Structure formats: structure tokens, C-alpha cells
């Protein structure tokens with residue numbers, strides 16, 4: 001079921017190398033006729049057989065989980081046994097990169113982003129896939145400000161998590177097994193980052209303090225959000241990072257709570273807001 005693309009090295013060039021969340025080479029590439037795309041590839045070296053093996057599994061996984069909120073595998077390139085993943089380029093980069101820009105992302109658009117992450121996670125969880133590393137770097141964003149979930153390091157993790165987003169139960173044990181509720185925890189911090197427009201815990205002095213603090217109940221600083229954040233999203237953020245994972249809702253639970261709030265309060269202004277973002281980017285940059 002894997003789409004093998006016939007594309008030679010002469011068809012495209014690497015415009016830039018991006019940080020690849022592990023063993024991969026990730027490149028923004030330009031095709032002679034088809035334009036920008038992302039390739040993940042293997043470096044030459046003594047580890048090429050296990051990496052190439054990992055890349056193929058990555059390709060199979062992305063392929064069987066095709067979905068509007070999962071990063072899109074366009075296909076695979078096979079040159080003398082060596083795989084390259086080709087993927088559809090999400091032009092605005094990751095979610096933190098969007099959040100940190102000079103142009104503020106408006107509430108309703110933040111609302112939709114959140115709704116789309118929930119849809120992505122219901123799907124993965126419905127498929128029996130625990131993400132294990134949900135964070136803003138793994139949420140990619142397109143020119144219409146729709147999002148898709150990526151997992152830059154998950155091909156590296158299976159061949160063998162990020163501190164700020166990790167459920168306390170997994171700081172506790174290196175042999176704790178991630179669950180759906182671990183992803184829900186991560187999602188809570190992502191919710192906070194979406195409204196804080198930055199990473200949490202800036203005042204942490206050291207890793208060991210941070211770990212001890214979070215295990216004891218500390219969470220990102222709700223008072224350090226300086227934009228308006230609806231009571232409902234604050235309430236949901238606090239529910240999703242409860243200490244007891246049994247106290248955290250499922251992702252279908254989150255959809256049940258959130259979508260009615262989105263549809264009645266936020267959805268109305270999204271198309272207009274996206275229109276002015278699109279204008280305040282192509283004028284303020286280009």
C-alpha cells in the first residue's frame with residue numbers, strides 16, 4: 001500500500017536542513033515542477049541498516065494513519081534500497097513558531113487549533129496509538145492555519161520524551177508505560193503554551209528541582225498567561241494535568257466538553273480572523 005514515488009536526485013534540491021528530532025536527516029526541498037516538500041532521509045554510516053529499517057516502519061505507520069490531522073506522507077523514494085520519506089510541507093512551521101511571531105494569533109483561531117489537536121488525538125487513540133511526545137514542536141501548521149500532528153522522534157524511540165510535557169508518573173519511573181492519559185497530560189501543557197505563547201517553567205533553576213516540583217503538584221503558571229483565556233479552557237487545562245491519571249479525561253471526553261464550547265462561542269469569527277492573519281502576514285513580512 002506504500003506509494004513509491006519515481007523521483008531522482010536531479011528532480012529537486014535541498015533548500016535547508018531542519019532539526020530532525022533524532023537520527024533522520026530532515027530537509028526542506030524544492031522540486032523542479034512540484035515546489036516545496038519535506039524529505040526525511042538516512043545519513044551514510046555504520047548505522048544505515050537500522051535507520052533505514054526504522055524509516056520504512058515510519059513510512060508504514062504514517063501511511064496506515066493517513067488522516068486530515070496527521071502529517072501527510074506523500075510517498076517513498078527507493079534508490080538502491082535506501083528510503084527517503086517525502087511529506088507535504090506545512091508552510092507555517094511548528095505551533096510554537098507560530099505563537100512566538102509578532103502577529104498575535106486570535107482567540108478563535110487558537111480555539112480551532114485546539115479543536116484540531118483533539119480531533120488528531122481521538123483518531124490516534126482510537127487507532128490504539130499512544131503518541132508519547134505531544135508538544136508544540138510536534139504540531140505543524142499550514143498557510144490556512146490548520147494543524148497536523150507529527151511525531152518527529154517516534155521513529156527514533158521505537159528503534160530503541162520532553163521534560164515540560166511529560167506526565168509526572170513518567171518522571172517517577174523510567175519503566176512506566178505511556179498511556180492515553182499520559183498524552184492527555186501533555187495536552188494540558190500544550191493548552192497552556194497556546195495561551196502563554198511560550199514554554200512553561202522559565203523560572204526553574206535546575207532539572208532536578210523541576211522534576212521534584214512537578215511530581216509534588218506544580219504546574220505551569222496560569223497567572224503568567226497575559227491574554228484572555230476562557231474559563232472553559234482554563235478549567236480543561238487544569239483537568240487534563242490532574243496528578244492522578246484516572247482523574248484525567250479521555251480525548252473523546254475532551255471533545256465532548258470542548259466542541260460545543262467552540263461551536264457556540266468561537267467558530268463564528270474564525271474565517272474572518274484567518275482572513276486578517278493572512279493579510280497581516282503577507283503585508284507585515286512580504
Ligand SMILES: CC(C)(C)c1cc(NC(=O)Nc2ccc(-c3cccc4c(N)nccc34)cc2)no1
Pocket residue numbers: 018026038040058061062065070071087088089090091092093094129131140149150151152154155
Ligand atoms: C502517525 C504518527 C503521528 C504517530 C507518526 C508520525 C510519524 N512521523 C513523523 O511525524 N515524521 C515527520 C513529520 C514531520 C517532519 C517535518 C519536520 C520539520 C518541518 C516540517 C514541515 N514544515 N512540514 C511537514 C513536515 C515537517 C519530519 C518528519 N511517525 O508516526
Ligand SMILES: [Mg+2]
Pocket residue numbers: 009010011012013014
Ligand atoms: Mg538534487
